[PDB]
Amino acid sequence: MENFQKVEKIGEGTYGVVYKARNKLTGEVVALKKIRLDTETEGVPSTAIREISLLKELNHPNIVKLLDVIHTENKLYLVFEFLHQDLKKFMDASALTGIPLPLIKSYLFQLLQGLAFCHSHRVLHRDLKPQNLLINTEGAIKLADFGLARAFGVPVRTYTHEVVTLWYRAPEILLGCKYYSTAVDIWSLGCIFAEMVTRRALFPGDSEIDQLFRIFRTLGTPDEVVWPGVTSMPDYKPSFPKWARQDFSKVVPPLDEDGRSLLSQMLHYDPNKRISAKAALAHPFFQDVTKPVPHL
Amino acid sequence: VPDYHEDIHTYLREMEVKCKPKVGYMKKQPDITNSMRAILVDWLVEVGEEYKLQNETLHLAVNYIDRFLSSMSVLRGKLQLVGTAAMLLASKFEEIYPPEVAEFVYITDDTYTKKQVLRMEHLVLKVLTFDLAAPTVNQFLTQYFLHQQPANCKVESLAMFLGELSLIDADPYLKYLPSVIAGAAFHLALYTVTGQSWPESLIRKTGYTLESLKPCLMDLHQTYLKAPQHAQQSIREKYKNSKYHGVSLLNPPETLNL
Ligand SMILES: O=C1Nc2ccc(S(=O)(=O)O)cc2/C1=C1/Nc2ccccc2C1=O
């Protein structure tokens, strides 16, 4: 903690903040995320317990690297690799010019790699959103914030329902399925893929029922044909308006035929049919992928 | 959705070796014994029982205890303080609704202060270097179950029952990897309930055979026969409940034909 030179506040944890800092002796620039403790309360936050143990278990070029955990009685400091910016911010800075397919393709490709890795190690991120994705000046993009993550078993059992930011939350969670898995992270990625193209959140509802309907109006209201089992889910209602499926080229018009195929597979209603990150990596959409570079 | 099953089974197989505690750490503990440890897990069983905790949380807790006691000698008056923190950490990791700190102080009828629980937590996290995602016998059993044609409520419950019995006796169970105890427990569960044996499909998946499981089967089968006479009885009581189809009431085979 002595050998660090804080550079500038950068973001906000829920029990701390994130600061850009530079290791005085090695010269390495890092990101410090301080977690507040203080005894006589509840001890170390379970979100930190999970974040640290799971993250230590995730070494991959597309997953932020946890360099160290400075553990003190008063507070707990997480030392991470540093990255220049996050995807939302970057998306805004492009809001007027747009994100070039090369970059969109490269970012999605990488993101699918980081996720396949998480899933290969039984880890559900459960909060993938543009703010939780970091990009550096080299064309790299990575999964960050493993604060809502959890180790899962095979098969899965019922986990926490209060999960995933509403805008990137999958139908099986919104409908109350008692078992949800890796497919929920794919849903998030499909929404982010869509978002990178058009530049504005695919389904920006403001309530669960509004989020569902905004989903139903794009992919159609699901039925036993398309998704065996819906009409039986806990939060399904036969009163649901029956919307017809909107042909995919209108959902993200600037998308080529490959993009459409990939996106459609990432947004499948039935979680057993929606493409896994592994399989997605082989999809034709990436045959021309490169690691271009950001626009900063 | 079985696209990651094998990547995960392989990863847990690698980890169970890296997370495994020292086989003979007890022999080196100056103050505590296996007997005292047995009393500790037995107690954690009913504690997990009183609070409706996952069985997965019980197994984690025991893994943390054995790993902590692998590098730290503890006085008999502190064994319970370690087991309490280990249980609290397991719940913070595995539970959706982990009972709060006060519950954990309370269950010790104030044998320790909230302060002591919190500090032990901090200490245990350090000794384990925050490596809490350990593989357990429960994680393997749950996987071996998918190889049952068709599912068998009683077999599963009996397999879990046997797996849990192994948490209680460091000797001989600390000398087997969780994936192996799981195989023995599943076979013995299966055989007892249906007459069937370790599936052809599991040899392919795990690489284990009756022959490789035999050393463990022998022990587990023995623990099973002597279960009614064991000083610790919280697992048996537990598995009499309908939630587990009263399998702990079933009669264990005279022999296994091996
Ligand atoms: O460089 C970094 N390293 C990390 C590591 C971990 C996180 S976390 O999402 O708070 O876990 C965030 C960050 C991080 C960040 N770097 C930046 C740069 C500009 C704007 C926002 C962020 C940011 O969140």
Has residue B228 been placed in a domain? Answer: yes
Interchain proximity B1–A73, CB inside 8 Å? no
Nearest to residue A116, comparing CAs of A143, A136, A155? A143
* Neighbouring C-beta atoms of residue A291, cutoff 10 Å: 14
A18: tokens are: 């994130």
A229 is in an annotated binding site: no
A2 is in an annotated binding site: no
A154 touches chain B (CB under 8 A): yes
Catalytic residues of A: 127
In the listed set B115, B133, B151, which residue is the last one of a domain according to the structure?
B133
Dist CA B142 CA B94 (whole Å): 15
Q: Report domain extents, chain A.
A: 1-84, 85-295
Chain A partners within 8 Å of B131 (Cβ): 53, 56-57
Has residue B85 been placed in a domain? Answer: yes
Residue B241 CB partners (closer than 8 Å, separation 6+)? none
How many Å lie between the centroid of ligand 1 and the Cα of residue B114? 34
In the listed set B133, B167, B194, which residue is the last one of a domain according to the structure?
B133
Count structural domains, chain B.
2
Query: Would you tell me the crossing angle of helices A46-56 and B79-94 to the nearest 10 degrees?
Result: 80
User: Do B28 and B105 fall within a single domain?
Assistant: yes
A226 is in an annotated binding site: no
Interchain proximity B8–A278, CB inside 8 Å? no
Dist CA A125 CA A57 (whole Å): 13
B18 touches chain A (CB under 8 A): no
Alpha-carbon distance A182 to nearest alpha carbon in chain B (angstroms):
9
How many Å lie between the centroid of ligand 1 and the Cα of residue A134? 7
Nearest to residue A192, comparing CAs of A284, A296, A110? A110
Beta strand segments in chain A, E: 4-11, 18-23, 29-36, 66-71, 75-81, 85-86, 123-124, 133-135, 141-143, 150-151
Dist CA A221 CA A242 (whole Å): 5
User: Do B212 and B150 fall within a single domain?
Assistant: yes
Dist CA A172 CA B63 (whole Å): 34
Dist CA B157 CA B193 (whole Å): 10
Dist CA A158 CA A138 (whole Å): 40
Which of B112, B130, B146 best tests the A interface by mutation, with the highest count of A CBs <10 A? B130
Question: The domain that contains B251 carries what CATH number?
Answer: 1.10.472.10
Do B136 and B178 meet the contact criterion of CB atoms below 8 Å apart?
A: yes
B122 touches chain A (CB under 8 A): yes
Has residue B239 been placed in a domain? Answer: yes
**Is the omega angle on the peptide bond into residue A234 within 30 degrees of 0, that is, cis?**
no
* Of residues A154, A159, A279, nearest to B96 (C-beta): A159
User: Does ligand 1 lie within 6 Å of residue A125's CB atom?
Assistant: no
Has residue B126 been placed in a domain? Answer: yes
Q: What is the CATH number of domain A1-84?
A: 3.30.200.20
A83 is in an annotated binding site: yes
CA-based angle A234:A239:A245, to the nearest 5?
95
User: Do B207 and B236 fall within a single domain?
Assistant: yes
Nearest to residue A50, comparing CAs of A159, A192, A141? A159
Cα–Cα distances in angstroms (integers) from residue B213 to residues A222, B162, B186, B199, B206, in the given order: 48, 14, 11, 13, 11
Dist CA A167 CA A235 (whole Å): 18
In the listed set B102, B133, B164, which residue is the last one of a domain according to the structure?
B133
User: Do B143 and B74 fall within a single domain?
Assistant: no
Has residue B1 been placed in a domain? Answer: no
Dist CA A143 CA A134 (whole Å): 7
User: Do B170 and B42 fall within a single domain?
Assistant: no
User: Do B162 and B115 fall within a single domain?
Assistant: no
Ligand 1 atom with the smallest distance to the CA of A51 is 11
Place of tokens 């047995």: B38
Domain of B173, in residue numbers: 7-20+134-258
Place of tokens 């245990």: B124
User: Do B34 and B102 fall within a single domain?
Assistant: yes
Mutate which of A18, A52, A64 for ligand 1? The one with the most ligand atoms within 8 Å of its CB, which is A18
User: Do B68 and B94 fall within a single domain?
Assistant: yes
Do A182 and A124 meet the contact criterion of CB atoms below 8 Å apart?
A: yes
> What residue in B sits closest to A115 (Cα-Cα)?
B4
Alpha-carbon distance B12 to nearest alpha carbon in chain A (angstroms):
8
> What residue in B sits closest to A160 (Cα-Cα)?
B96
User: Do B237 and B200 fall within a single domain?
Assistant: yes
Nearest to residue A31, comparing CAs of A148, A136, A165? A136
* Neighbouring C-beta atoms of residue B40, cutoff 10 Å: 22
Do A165 and A206 meet the contact criterion of CB atoms below 8 Å apart?
A: no
Residue A225 CB partners (closer than 8 Å, separation 6+)? none
Ligand 1 atom with the smallest distance to the CA of A144 is 9
B98 touches chain A (CB under 8 A): yes
User: Do B125 and B215 fall within a single domain?
Assistant: no
Cα–Cα distances in angstroms (integers) from residue A279 to residues A167, A186, A201, A265, B191, in the given order: 25, 12, 25, 10, 38
User: Do B128 and B138 fall within a single domain?
Assistant: no
Cα–Cα distances in angstroms (integers) from residue B111 to residues B39, B81, B118, in the given order: 16, 8, 14
User: Do B15 and B67 fall within a single domain?
Assistant: no
A46 touches chain B (CB under 8 A): yes
State the method.
X-ray
Nearest to residue B202, comparing CAs of B244, B159, B258, B250? B159
Dist CA B205 CA A204 (whole Å): 44
Has residue B2 been placed in a domain? Answer: no
Has residue B230 been placed in a domain? Answer: yes
Do A113 and A62 meet the contact criterion of CB atoms below 8 Å apart?
A: yes
Dist CA B56 CA B200 (whole Å): 27
Superfamily of domain A85-295: Transferase(Phosphotransferase) domain 1 (1.10.510.10)
